[PDB]
């Protein structure tokens, strides 16, 4: 940010903000993604691939009647899990399987199993909401959820709801996740300001007890908050370090968020109210972050590993290691657009916006209004791999390369004179399409080049 | 998992006051709905702008401003009392009037 724009700085800021690890966050060691996901599998214990073939295949029951010795265990009333229980509890088996390679098939226990799980409800609780066991007791694959006429959280789970998370949660237990700190419900008065790591909350990690708001994340909207309902950044790269990442799902072409073709609830958006939070997986495929249908100002990271400030939230949404995500859509608020390594279409919509198109030949829309393209490095758009700024409007967008001249200007010249910076703007009538040919390193030629559809002057370029 | 509180179990009147300034408490009302009584304009001074709303999380509670989203964020201590940090590092109190 020295020496650039205020927009390049708006850029830099937000690829920042969220950085982990080698600082403090809260008074407290910043853990890395890698960090994090071994705290949550420190205990060390698994499933084994018993039956040899690459997979944890895993049985479930729902219990109908107390297991044997039930009353043993000092739990009060039992109870089977309701048809909105079963439901809700399926779609979060989904949303682990979905990320691991571990199967969850209904069932009884069964000679090709790796192992078997159970869920029923419990009456009586000396403080917790819920248990399970871990995958190396004697009761592993057991979850259990409190229900009594002082709880009914568990009763009525939903996407966004604290009741689906903590079906999320327990079944974490059971595939092996630890909370990320040595604490427990009903166990004392456990707080955040005792917790191992700064990024010990609900923005990282479902298995957190501390909310997201304690590390800045806002996810209230119209008065009230939200809660991840499928597993988040953490989460996944914990639960891939155990069983191994599903290359499988998803990979063909998916979008994320409106128009979703992910065919998950917590990755659908259909209106401008909605609260998204989740984390994104995919197998494969030229993918899409879909977030047109906000009206809020939103900053949109297309990093592995990165966040983003989603539909007037902020540090809701975010893309898992080792996902390679192309797209990004705006929406008619002033947004930024962050792009990555790929080649990425980036659209801004309605509203003036920001776009970073990074490594690789990217298309870049602004839309309407006034939008700034920025520049970073010389390989963000080279002679032999260059962006096209789709609709570049002269006299109100703006390309910005600040962050390569660090505002020491260009020479603007009918052809390279030998220098560092020298800039030749061409306009090819038959094709609509402006030029931009900068020589960065003063070899004489072009090291640079960006092409606009629609002519480009001098004026439109901030350098 | 923490036992997230209701509405209905977290409404009832609250003194508010900042440690080292005691004698300078508010008491305001929440109501089961989620909003608070008129006293609430008392937590202004700390706050800057007014809360309109509150909700529970399993860990504490978020009181909401005007536009729905914007939060101070306090952690549950004990069986009614939450406590945060206004003005910097000063440490906020809230407990069962
Ligand atoms: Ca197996
Ligand atoms: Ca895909
Ligand atoms: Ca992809
Ligand atoms: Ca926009
Ligand atoms: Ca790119
Ligand atoms: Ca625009
Ligand atoms: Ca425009
Ligand atoms: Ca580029
Ligand atoms: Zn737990």
């Given at each position: 940010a020295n020496?650039?724009?205020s927009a390049f700085?708006?850029?830099?800021?937000?690829?920042?903000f969220?950085?982990?690890?080698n600082?403090?966050?809260?008074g407290?060691?910043?853990?890395?993604?890698?960090?994090?996901?071994?705290?949550?599998?420190?205990?060390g214990?698994?499933?084994?691939?018993?039956?040899?073939?690459?997979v944890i295949?895993?049985?479930?029951?729902?219990l109908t009647?107390?297991?044997p010795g039930?009353?043993?265990?000092?739990?009060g009333?039992?109870?089977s899990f309701?048809?909105?229980?079963?439901?809700?509890?399926?779609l979060?088996?989904?949303?682990?399987?979905?990320?691991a390679?571990?199967?969850?098939?209904?069932?009884p226990?069964?000679?090709?199993d790796?192992?078997?799980?159970?869920?029923?409800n419990?009456s009586?609780?000396?403080?917790?909401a819920?248990?399970?066991y871990?995958?190396?007791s004697?009761?592993?694959?057991?979850s259990?959820?409190?229900?009594?006429?002082?709880?009914?959280?568990?009763?009525?789970?939903g996407?966004?709801?604290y009741?689906?998370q903590?079906?999320t949660?327990?079944?974490?237990?059971?595939?092996?996740?630890?909370?990320?700190?040595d604490?427990?419900?009903?166990?004392?008065?456990?707080?955040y300001?005792?917790?191992?790591?700064g990024?010990?909350?609900?923005?990282?990690?479902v298995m957190?007890?501390?909310?997201?708001?304690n590390?800045?994340?806002?996810?209230?909207?119209?008065?009230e908050?939200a809660?991840a309902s499928?597993?988040?950044?953490?989460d996944?790269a914990?639960?891939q370090?155990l069983?191994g990442?599903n290359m499988?799902?998803?990979?063909?072409?998916?979008?994320?968020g409106?128009?979703?073709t992910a065919d998950?609830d917590?990755?659908?958006?259909?209106?401008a109210?909605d609260?998204?939070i989740?984390?994104?997986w995919?197998?494969?495929?030229?993918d899409t972050?879909?977030?047109?249908g906000?009206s809020?100002?939103?900053?949109?990271?297309?990093?592995?590993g990165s966040?983003?400030?989603?539909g007037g939230?902020?540090?809701?949404?975010?893309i898992?290691?080792?996902?390679?995500?192309?797209?990004?859509?705006?929406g008619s608020?002033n947004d930024?657009?962050?792009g990555?390594?790929?080649?990425?279409?980036?659209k801004?919509?309605?509203?003036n916006d920001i776009?970073?198109?990074?490594?690789?030949?990217?298309?870049?829309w602004?839309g309407?209004?006034?939008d700034?393209f920025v520049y970073?490095?010389v390989?963000?758009?080279?002679?032999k791999?260059?962006?096209?700024?789709?609709?570049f409007q002269?006299?109100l967008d703006?390309?910005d390369?600040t962050?390569?001249?660090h505002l020491?200007?260009?020479?603007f010249?009918?052809?390279?004179?030998?220098?560092?910076?020298?800039?030749?703007?061409?306009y090819?009538?038959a094709?609509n399409a402006?030029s931009?040919?900068v020589?960065?390193?003063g070899?004489?030629?072009?090291?640079f080049?960006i092409?606009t559809?629609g002519?480009?002057?001098?004026?439109?370029?901030?350098a | 998992?923490?036992m997230?509180?209701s509405?209905a179990?977290?409404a009832?009147?609250?003194?508010?006051?900042v440690?080292?300034?005691?004698q300078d408490?508010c008491?305001v009302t929440?109501?089961?709905?989620?909003?608070?009584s008129?006293?609430?304009?008392?937590l202004?001074?700390?706050?800057?702008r007014?809360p309109?709303t509150?909700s529970?999380?399993?860990?504490?509670?978020?009181?909401?401003?005007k536009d729905?989203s914007?939060?101070?964020?306090?952690?549950?201590?004990e069986?009614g009392?939450?406590?945060?940090?206004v003005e910097?590092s000063?440490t906020?109190?809230?407990?069962?009037?």
């Amino acid at each position: 940010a020295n020496g650039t724009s205020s927009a390049f700085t708006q850029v830099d800021n937000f690829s920042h903000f969220y950085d982990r690890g080698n600082h403090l966050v809260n008074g407290k060691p910043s853990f890395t993604v890698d960090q994090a996901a071994d705290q949550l599998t420190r205990s060390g214990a698994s499933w084994y691939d018993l039956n040899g073939d690459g997979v944890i295949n895993l049985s479930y029951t729902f219990l109908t009647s107390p297991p044997p010795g039930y009353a043993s265990r000092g739990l009060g009333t039992f109870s089977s899990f309701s048809g909105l229980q079963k439901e809700q509890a399926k779609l979060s088996l989904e949303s682990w399987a979905d990320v691991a390679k571990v199967t969850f098939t209904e069932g009884p226990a069964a000679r090709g199993d790796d192992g078997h799980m159970t869920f029923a409800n419990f009456s009586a609780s000396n403080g917790g909401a819920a248990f399970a066991y871990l995958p190396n007791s004697s009761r592993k694959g057991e979850s259990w959820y409190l229900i009594n006429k002082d709880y009914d959280v568990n009763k009525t789970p939903g996407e966004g709801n604290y009741g689906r998370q903590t079906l999320t949660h327990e079944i974490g237990h059971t595939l092996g996740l630890s909370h990320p700190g040595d604490y427990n419900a009903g166990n004392g008065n456990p707080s955040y300001r005792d917790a191992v790591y700064g990024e010990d909350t609900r923005a990282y990690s479902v298995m957190s007890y501390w909310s997201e708001k304690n590390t800045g994340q806002v996810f209230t909207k119209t008065g009230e908050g939200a809660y991840a309902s499928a597993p988040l950044l953490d989460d996944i790269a914990a639960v891939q370090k155990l069983y191994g990442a599903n290359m499988e799902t998803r990979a063909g072409d998916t979008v994320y968020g409106f128009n979703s073709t992910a065919d998950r609830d917590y990755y659908s958006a259909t209106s401008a109210t909605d609260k998204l939070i989740f984390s994104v997986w995919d197998g494969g495929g030229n993918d899409t972050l879909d977030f047109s249908g906000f009206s809020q100002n939103q900053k949109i990271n297309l990093a592995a590993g990165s966040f983003s400030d989603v539909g007037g939230m902020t540090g809701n949404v975010s893309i898992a290691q080792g996902v390679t995500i192309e797209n990004a859509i705006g929406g008619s608020g002033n947004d930024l657009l962050l792009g990555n390594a790929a080649s990425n279409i980036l659209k801004g919509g309605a509203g003036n916006d920001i776009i970073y198109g990074g490594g690789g030949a990217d298309k870049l829309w602004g839309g309407s209004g006034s939008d700034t393209f920025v520049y970073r490095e010389v390989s963000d758009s080279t002679p032999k791999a260059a962006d096209t700024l789709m609709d570049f409007q002269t006299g109100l967008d703006k390309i910005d390369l600040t962050g390569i001249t660090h505002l020491s200007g260009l020479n603007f010249v009918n052809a390279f004179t030998g220098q560092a910076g020298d800039a030749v703007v061409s306009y090819n009538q038959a094709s609509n399409a402006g030029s931009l040919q900068v020589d960065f390193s003063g070899h004489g030629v072009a090291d640079f080049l960006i092409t606009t559809v629609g002519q480009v002057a001098t004026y439109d370029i901030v350098a | 998992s923490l036992m997230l509180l209701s509405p209905a179990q977290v409404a009832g009147s609250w003194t508010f006051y900042v440690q080292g300034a005691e004698q300078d408490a508010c008491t305001v009302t929440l109501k089961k709905d989620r909003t608070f009584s008129a006293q609430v304009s008392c937590l202004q001074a700390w706050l800057g702008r007014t809360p309109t709303t509150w909700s529970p999380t399993p860990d504490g509670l978020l009181l909401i401003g005007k536009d729905g989203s914007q939060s101070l964020f306090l952690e549950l201590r004990e069986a009614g009392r939450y406590e945060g940090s206004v003005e910097g590092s000063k440490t906020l109190v809230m407990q069962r009037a």
